């Protein structure tokens, strides 16, 4: 009946984990419709002078295909 | 030489597992050419009053890239 | 806000995979309320004289906790 | 000597990841005694108009069995 | 005391998943004795014009070694 | 037909691995009926002055559900 | 801030593993901009009369999304 | 140069884990030559009136192929 | 050319996940130079009377080796 | 319909990874018919005075069963 | 607050599994302070004329870092 | 009896995979004694204008502890 597609995005943020996830989802929303669920695959990031520099949440986003 | 792409789809069906897989592949065939193989990643679904409500087969579909 | 619980069941059937899943969900329904989704963890079984004897679907069942 | 049990819960929250984990543990505390440790199995969630709608932390909770 | 061996087979069928599993077990029975249990490792297949062309169930078969 | 449930326990012992497994199964037997099989998921433990202090075997226990 | 996308390709070559990876990346470069990193997921291949016939490197390619 | 083969066996014993492993290796030694190393894949078993009934160590055994 | 080393740390914090990661990286920075990236392996923790007591992020830290 | 068997071999070579894989397949070819595909499970090896001493590619080889 | 380090050791013994684990922890204790917990990653070993020759337990050891 | 330690290194090279592994092992040899075996955990790398820029082999190196 219904068919969904999953797309793997990496959301990044210097503020936090929630912000990194939201960054990815805010970009998906600009282009994709019927965004339904997400799955966090891994949490990575870079290290700077002040500790964590950039949080990087690797993310699978599922959306319903039209037509 | 050849390069293939894999795309992750979720086929759903109220009838059965085979029907769920076929639903995903029937939607892929509308848009993609040179579909070659698939790999079932996981089997999930929803529960209703009569037991299984919707079978949901998470699926990787491999196809040959042109040019 | 909401909290769900997951419970690991193994549904068995001599007839097929769908029947094995349905057996587990039919038993869960007798006792548990607000059954929402399931996840197939593995498919196993026994072998007899006529091939497959019993299909055994190891299954995670998610339901909403009350109150 | 001692025997512990592990139970798989899914804590949900619209506010954040920490709130989702706390939701699950607050519900466990109402019913279970000698809660000791937890293990995050996966982080999932739903998508709405404003990005993340509901954070969902799938969680294993370990507690000491009495007697 | 007892020692079992596991052998990895791939059963294929154009008709369905159950038929693929049965194809592997029917071939094992021709040659091996004391076949006891099986474990499905992965589900793959090929794609044709009519959707799924051949279902391919990768399968571990366990049997008791004699003597 | 039949439906089984799996429950995740952690047996602990200062004496050894076998004693840790037996501790979990001895506690299960007090409360659960038709215990059939177990699966070791992981082996952990604590460290003291004399080496290993407590062996901790994380364990899945499968039993047949009644009625 | 930044958002990356990951795409799963399978590079193939009769010459070697490096050539298979390079095949996939050369095809990505024709169409995608800001290609940054790759991750080898698995190495497979076909067998002919002279041993290995075609090396097949399944590959995840990460690139920065524009705008 | 050298080629090794791996074979998956399941050693069982009512006495203990070490005895289960040794049961598998004692049977391998009767038939196979140049046995070099082993890898424990999982530890399972059955449950009886007195706790553990039979320990079952699933095992990969590596040996050098002749010629 | 370049060689990096990875070290596995567990950062802990009573405040949150981000604080737990930062605690680990702040300790690494005291002793190690050329810290570049991190990978979260798992998220665990302890439970107290107020829910989560201590967040524990198991973490791999990668840094470039000198000379 | 068709049934395939998978066999786990370890090909070794002092010259390189491709040579290690080819060593395994060249030995399989001597004894087995209808060799079709392979899957690299892991890459290991030994260390000597001059760096890598022996590359060791653990390999699954799939072939069609006759008759 | 607190930061722990994990180190991966392989304890070996001809006597048994418990002895292999203890061998690793006895060596760690000579050099490292505040050893707290361990995690068994895998169980391997070598094969001789009399069956198992050497048990080899690959082990992660966690200890609290000072100051 | 014997105790080994494992250390996780990432060897990099612009020339190839073998060169990346050798880079890691050549650096280990400068400082560590009784290097015995290695295990490749993952293969990653960076992308430049000419395809692959730097191969990066994440590697576990095992060596016998002295004394
Ligand atoms: C390049 C790329 C990142 C740009 O992404 P993007 O900005 O989201 O662009 P897309 O065209 O993919 O956007 C979605 C499209 O599907 C439509 N769409 C949105 N929601 C949809 C839905 N739920 N179902 C079906 N179609 C949908 C949109 O209308 C849009 O189509 P449009 O041309 O009418 O505007 C992206 O297209 C990509 O990575 N695709 C694959 C590229 C690739 O891997 N190449 C192969 C190299 S070997
Ligand atoms: C949105 C989406 C789901 C729509 O699905 P769809 O029905 O397949 O629509 P598409 O436009 O992708 O159709 C397939 C395209 O692939 C092409 N194609 C099919 N098979 C091909 C092959 N073997 N080789 C090369 N191209 C091929 C088709 O010709 C078509 O392109 P065209 O419009 O130039 O003729 C899909 O485009 C997509 O996932 N893109 C979004 C990716 C994404 O997540 N973007 C980033 C968001 S932040
Ligand atoms: C090639 C192969 C698929 C042949 O399949 P097959 O049709 O089942 O043929 P078999 O040789 O296994 O015949 C069955 C054998 O198992 C024995 N057997 C059956 N049940 C048994 C049991 N429960 N306990 C012990 N032996 C049993 C039979 O007696 C027979 O042995 P026999 O020839 O001494 O009489 C399979 O044997 C194989 O893949 N061999 C290994 C190939 C390999 O890996 N090569 C080395 C690496 S290159
Ligand atoms: C078939 C497919 C692989 C072909 O890819 P391709 O030929 O290499 O190139 P595409 O046309 O998809 O992508 C190139 C586009 O991405 C853009 N792109 C490249 N780098 C980009 C970047 N970093 N950021 C945003 N966009 C980028 C290019 O400018 C181009 O866009 P434009 O032509 O609209 O200006 C691709 O269309 C695809 O797989 N899409 C998804 C198909 C799918 O899953 N279908 C659903 C079936 S159910
Ligand atoms: C011992 C062993 C390594 C020998 O390897 P080998 O050099 O390849 O010898 P094989 O017996 O496997 O040779 C292949 C056999 O199967 C046949 N065979 C080859 N290709 C075949 C195919 N595509 N389909 C069916 N059979 C095939 C060959 O003709 C040969 O049979 P034959 O001797 O009856 O002529 C291997 O047979 C083996 O691992 N056996 C199992 C050992 C084991 O684990 N048993 C339990 C001990 S605890
Ligand atoms: C059933 C089974 C476990 C019993 O086999 P077994 O008791 O170990 O005896 P096998 O003959 O197979 O293997 C031992 C033989 O290998 C040979 N051998 C031993 N080690 C060897 C090695 N290192 N290299 C090459 N040959 C070796 C020996 O000569 C010995 O006796 P042989 O002269 O008859 O060949 C085994 O035959 C089997 O599982 N085969 C595969 C079954 C299968 O999956 N086939 C397809 C069915 S769908
Ligand atoms: C004990 C321990 C936790 C303390 O960690 P620590 O505070 O970082 O102490 P270190 O010994 O690593 O000191 C850091 C050293 O690394 C050096 N270093 C830092 N960055 C470096 C870089 N990027 N390249 C090369 N060297 C570097 C520093 O210069 C310093 O060297 P110094 O002694 O010349 O001043 C840690 O040393 C340890 O776990 N070592 C291994 C213990 C072990 O497992 N042994 C076997 C037990 S069985
Ligand atoms: C920074 C670092 C990589 C430098 O590595 P390095 O170049 O190999 O230098 P090291 O001093 O650690 O290693 C060589 C030492 O190990 C010894 N060694 C070599 N082989 C040995 C063996 N098999 N058994 C015991 N010791 C051995 C050498 O003799 C030498 O000791 P010595 O200088 O006292 O004579 C290393 O200090 C490190 O990674 N430490 C851990 C970092 C860490 O996790 N710290 C905690 C931060 S929060
Ligand atoms: C060779 C090696 C195994 C020797 O192990 P070792 O027996 O523990 O010897 P170390 O020198 O590390 O001694 C342990 C140190 O940890 C310190 N220490 C012990 N417990 C501690 C704790 N919990 N917190 C902080 N420091 C602690 C000890 O005091 C000692 O340091 P000190 O002698 O300077 O006072 C070495 O430590 C090692 O594995 N280092 C890694 C080197 C490496 O990776 N090489 C680069 C590869 S290219
Ligand atoms: C394979 C798959 C995984 C899903 N995972 C989740 C989950 O992570 N959490 C959740 O709330 N919903 C999950 N969903 C349910 C989807 O959000 C569901 O499709 C949506 O609620 C209704 O679908 P629709 O787009 O047809 O309206 C999942 C659905 C599928 C197909
Ligand atoms: C990584 C990968 C995985 C594949 N898996 C399968 C498989 O699951 N089953 C199968 O029959 N063929 C499998 N194939 C073979 C493809 O179907 C093959 O590319 C096709 O048969 C011929 O390729 P073509 O598109 O160039 O004609 C696989 C190929 C690749 C690249
Ligand atoms: C298998 C297992 C896993 C554990 N994991 C953790 C951990 O994640 N973090 C932690 O602080 N304690 C962990 N613990 C320690 C428990 O919290 C421990 O049982 C408790 O601190 C003391 O036990 P008690 O209930 O008998 O008082 C673990 C214990 C077991 C049995
Ligand atoms: C490691 C292993 C896995 C097994 N898994 C299953 C299972 O998937 N389902 C099942 O019904 N029996 C399973 N069994 C039980 C076997 O079927 C059992 O050996 C058989 O019922 C009785 O053994 P026998 O050949 O000595 O008569 C398993 C046994 C072992 C050794
Ligand atoms: C999740 C993720 C994984 C990455 N893995 C690697 C790695 O495998 N090796 C590497 O050199 N760089 C890796 N990078 C770093 C990227 O190459 C990095 O984004 C690039 O060097 C700079 O990003 P830019 O496109 O914004 O300039 C990774 C980055 C992300 C987001
Ligand atoms: C992939 C593979 C895995 C191995 N694992 C181990 C191990 O677990 N422990 C060990 O002591 N030796 C291990 N070895 C080393 C073998 O025992 C080695 O082949 C033997 O010591 C010497 O080989 P030979 O049969 O040619 O004499 C391994 C070898 C290979 C090929």
CSV table of C-alpha atoms in Angstrom, one decimal, chain H residues 22 25 37 45-46 59:
chain,number,residue,atom,x,y,z
H,22,UNK,CA,36.2,-29.4,24.8
H,25,UNK,CA,37.1,-29.7,19.8
H,37,UNK,CA,42.1,-21.6,16.8
H,45,UNK,CA,21.6,-23.9,27.0
H,46,UNK,CA,18.6,-25.7,28.4
H,59,UNK,CA,31.9,-22.2,18.3
